[PDB]
Nucleic acid binder design. Structure first.
Ligand SMILES: [Zn+2]
Ligand SMILES: [Zn+2]
Lengths: 197, 197
DNA sequence: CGGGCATGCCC
DNA sequence: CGGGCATGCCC
């Protein structure tokens, strides 16, 4: 069976979608999301807020899993991992994991025993009463360019909502470029899309 | 006592000097030496020929040691090592060593038990009869720019001629930039010296 | 091959 | 902070 996880959007019966905060205009804003590109530009090891929106309430026990895969066909079968430098200079998160969640006391880090893929899982909590969404704080612990890790290859973050039995309730994904200057790089790729895309 | 090794030239009683081969004009020539800068520009893990010239014959038992130190005052006390990526993707040479010698059956790699500095040593052989010099083939196993290793910091290679008792007979050093495009980078730094130096 | 992009860093 | 260098890589 395939060891490449699906990245196909599946908004499913709960109308699961992701949301992203607006950000400032700074060249090196800590994180900024491009709707045109469906791509987050963010700095390493800093907060990357991601909102979970649903139209209907997931059952008790639902989980929220994040996993990175390389976007390009030629790299999709290689597991996305922390580069050797950041692993050596690295609480619960194993040092080989690229994606962490901060501020959650129930985080689990998983190393799949068959596909070798890393994932990080937290329980689904429904929005607080006055609220339309639930926000998880992700961190990516290498730059996209890290030698011996992502090595400039774009990744997708796959977010899956899964019940406690392991049924797939919803799937969304967004591309990520972890970089020194998120504002600069987002503008550069939006301009490239307009001019050459 | 100091754990920073001397880099001061000491041509000594044997009139020990280093020589370098001329190279071609290519942008990415595999190695090229700048006399103006006393600096070798070379690609990683490829041959970097270095000639040993003496006016008088070293005694039997003499050794030839190579060791890297950071050139800049602010980095001189840090040991020069292979970056974590190239160490993990790495015969006798320990994977943490930046400098190797190829084609010598008597090479020794040393990790100083007090200063933690790495060195690689081969016996001195006098030039063959028709010859003015002895050539050792060094390899540098990271680029100067390697993240988590040299990290763009220029190094000096220190070459010492040492008798078997450990007396210093001669010392010379040359700066090194290990890079993708030795021809391009040598020309760039020579032009910078002329214009801004 | 040599022109020119890449992108963390400039000190 | 934003202009511009850096330098392995372009696919
Ligand atoms: Zn990294
Ligand atoms: Zn390296």
């Amino acid at each position: 069976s395939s060891s490449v996880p699906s990245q196909k959007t599946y908004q499913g019966s709960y109308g699961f979608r992701l949301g992203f905060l607006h950000s400032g205009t700074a060249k090196s804003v800590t994180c900024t999301y491009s709707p045109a590109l469906n791509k987050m530009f963010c700095q390493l090891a800093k907060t990357c807020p991601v909102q979970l929106w649903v139209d209907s309430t997931p059952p008790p026990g639902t989980r929220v899993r994040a996993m990175a895969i390389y976007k390009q066909s030629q790299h999709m079968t290689e597991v996305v991992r922390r580069c050797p430098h950041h692993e050596r200079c690295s609480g619960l998160a194993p040092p080989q994991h690229l994606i962490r969640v901060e501020g959650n006391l129930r985080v689990e880090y998983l190393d799949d025993r068959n596909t070798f893929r890393h994932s990080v899982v937290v329980p689904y909590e429904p929005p607080e009463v006055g609220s339309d969404c639930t926000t998880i704080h992700y961190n990516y612990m290498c730059n996209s360019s890290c030698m011996g890790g992502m090595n400039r290859r774009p990744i997708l973050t796959i977010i899956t909502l899964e019940d406690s039995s392991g049924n797939l309730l919803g799937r969304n994904s967004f591309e990520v470029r972890v970089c020194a200057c998120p504002g600069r790089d987002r503008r550069t790729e939006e301009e490239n899309l307009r001019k050459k895309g």
